[PDB]
Design a protein around this ligand. Structure first.
Ligand SMILES: O=C(Nc1cn[nH]c1-c1cc(Cl)ccc1OC(F)F)c1cnn2cccnc12
Length: 279
């Protein structure tokens, strides 16, 4: 079985990225021992979320799309997710160091690719729930792929109701996710608009969606922050236009943030939107 990897040949090279429960490392699957094996990205849990990883491994295994990271296999006894290695890392890490390389045309092409990969996920009846630049991987200067699926859940129904909301990226969530933990495909459209903002800002730390919202709502509200974040979304207040971003790209972003899940555009429609701007 080429999808079965033995632990003894999986040679850790370095750490790539880290979440709260999950960890991604660069490894070389080296059966020959001469350090000639292929490099792979390995997802393991930090030392119980074993059940969610197993489900995530099964979601990824059956996802086949050029804008979604390729599943390569597993490593058992207790499981590790084996995927292809994308050396340019995430958009969160890649964009600040490549401003000279990536221009608006390229940013909008990335925008399409994320949309396409997201629209394939939704058509397979899945909600992502963690769509941010940190979960988007860079293949090259021309191609991006959705790199993580840790929060991904199957919609039965227009939505799936979440029980555990503890590591939720609240500054990327739609008001229904914040108010009732209700996740629709439109919730992923809302998160796309936030991911779009990061992308057009080259993922700048000082103008991150969290920081732009803390300046909007007030940074000293502690545990009242989500309520006040919902308060400002209700008022009609949204993330500001990114510097040097044309108003029509900002208009496509504003359509991702229509308070009502039904008033929001679909990914198919966003694809058409950016395609008209690329001609
Ligand atoms: O560089 C990579 N990963 C990375 C960089 N920083 N943080 C992460 C990361 C961390 C976690 Cl816990 C989960 C997903 C992550 O990547 C994300 F961007 F999708 C990488 C490269 N190929 N590859 C394939 C699959 C997964 N990761 C990688």
């Amino acid at each position: 079985d080429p999808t079965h990897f033995e632990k003894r040949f999986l040679k850790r090279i370095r750490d790539l990225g880290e979440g709260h429960f999950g960890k991604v490392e660069l490894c070389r699957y080296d059966p020959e021992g001469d350090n000639t094996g292929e490099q792979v990205a390995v997802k393991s849990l930090k030392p119980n979320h074993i059940a969610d990883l197993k489900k995530e491994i099964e979601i990824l295994r059956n996802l086949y799309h050029e804008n979604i990271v390729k599943y390569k296999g597993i490593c058992t006894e207790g499981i590790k997710l084996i995927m292809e290695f994308l050396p340019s890392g995430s958009l969160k890490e890649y964009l600040p160091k490549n401003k000279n390389k990536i221009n608006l045309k390229q940013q909008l092409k990335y925008a399409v690719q994320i949309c396409k990969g997201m629209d394939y996920l939704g058509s397979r009846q899945y909600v992502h729930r963690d769509l941010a630049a940190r979960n988007v991987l860079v293949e090259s200067e021309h191609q991006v792929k959705i790199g993580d699926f840790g929060l991904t859940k199957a919609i039965e129904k227009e939505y799936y109701t979440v029980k555990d909301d503890r590591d939720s990226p609240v500054f990327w969530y739609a008001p229904e996710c914040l108010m009732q933990s209700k996740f629709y495909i439109a919730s992923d459209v809302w998160s796309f608009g936030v991911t779009l903002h990061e992308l057009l800002t080259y993922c700048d730390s000082d103008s991150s969606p969290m920081a732009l919202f803390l300046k909007m709502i007030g940074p000293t509200h502690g545990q009242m922050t989500v309520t006040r974040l919902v308060n400002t979304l209700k008022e009609g207040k949204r993330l500001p236009c990114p510097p040097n971003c044309p108003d029509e790209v900002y208009q496509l972003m504003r359509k991702c943030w229509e308070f009502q899940p039904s008033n929001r555009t679909s990914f198919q429609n966003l694809i058409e939107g950016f395609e008209a701007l690329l001609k």
